[PDB]
Amino acid sequence: MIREERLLKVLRAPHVSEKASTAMEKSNTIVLKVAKDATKAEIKAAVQKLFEVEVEVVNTLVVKGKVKRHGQRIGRRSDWKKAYVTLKEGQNL
Amino acid sequence: SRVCQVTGKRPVTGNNRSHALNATKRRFLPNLHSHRFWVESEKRFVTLRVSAKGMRVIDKKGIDTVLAELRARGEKY
């Protein structure tokens, strides 16, 4: 099918909120970080359903977790999946 | 393993004793050979690894009774 609205829990944060993200928003693409087990078709259907805008293609990259912690206590941030949602037809930006 | 399959004879470990009573570990082994016995009721030859005492037990008791005890124990015949 088109994947279910319950299973469309992939859209976590709508914006990475960065200079690169705003630059490719003002030119062409929406940048947002989605899930850990999402697929390209899942993010495409999520954008087309949860937003009103149709989507051309989705480009996904997995971001590693930073350590970012001192010497006495050692920690590691969570690995997160980013997507580059390209939407050309039917866009307002 | 070397099992008599009728009488259940097993390798048993012992000692070698010399004239000066030195002790060295040795193994006592059964007299096992693979023998086909003719079973009339099954109309076929059944091959079993058996001892000499197991063969005399077969000659005393009957191959039918021996295979019945074998089926009771569960070992494949």
Partner: protein, 63 residues
């Protein structure tokens, strides 16, 4: 006796489960990433609400 869910012993709980996920929990996530103040207890309340609805779904298979 500590908690009462007689308002959700009704049938057709899947549609309010859908309304709790779509446009409510997703909207709280988008508004929390944008930055809002009153959303903070609302995420906890919505998560406990979907937990209650799904336990009643596991109770009655009629749904």
């Amino acid at each position: 006796m500590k908690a009462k869910e007689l308002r959700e012993k009704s049938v057709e709980e899947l549609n309010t489960e859908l309304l709790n996920l779509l446009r409510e929990q997703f909207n709280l996530r988008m508004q929390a990433a944008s930055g809002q103040l009153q959303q903070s207890h609302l995420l906890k309340q919505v998560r406990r609400d979907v937990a209650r609805v799904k336990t009643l779904l596991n109770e009655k298979a009629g749904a």
